[PDB]
Amino acid sequence: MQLTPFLILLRKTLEQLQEKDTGNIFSEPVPLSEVPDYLDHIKKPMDFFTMKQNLEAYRYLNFDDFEEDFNLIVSNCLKYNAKDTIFYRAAVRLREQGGAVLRQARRQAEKM
Numbered sequence: 001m002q003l004t005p006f007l008i009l010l011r012k013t014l015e016q017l018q019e020k021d022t023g024n025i026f027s028e029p030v031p032l033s034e035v036p037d038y039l040d041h042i043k044k045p046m047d048f049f050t051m052k053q054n055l056e057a058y059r060y061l062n063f064d065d066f067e068e069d070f071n072l073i074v075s076n077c078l079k080y081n082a083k084d085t086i087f088y089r090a091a092v093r094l095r096e097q098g099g100a101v102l103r104q105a106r107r108q109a110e111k112m
């Protein structure tokens, strides 16, 4: 497999995932200044901006490593927030809508 088309695919996929996060609550790192206890519970914070940075730093050379960090966005949010919150529901919705985006993107990677 060639690097350039793969990274083009991942860029598109990340844009598509970001589109599902309509409130943009996962666009940037959880502000540790406003959520001071966040690192007490969450071992590896993740967000779409950080994913973009990782993508361009060649930290995603296969689909699984890409998907693993997306899954962290979801799981961190489910872990930190109570079930009766907007944030928790948003993570559930992102898991649902994102999974479909991921399945289609992976099929296109596998054709490479």
Ligand SMILES: O=c1[nH]ccc2ccccc12
Binding pocket: 025, 026, 030, 035, 073, 076, 077, 078, 080, 081, 087
């Ligand atoms: O774990 C989180 N992900 C995205 C937003 C957020 C906001 C407050 C607390 C946790 C999170």
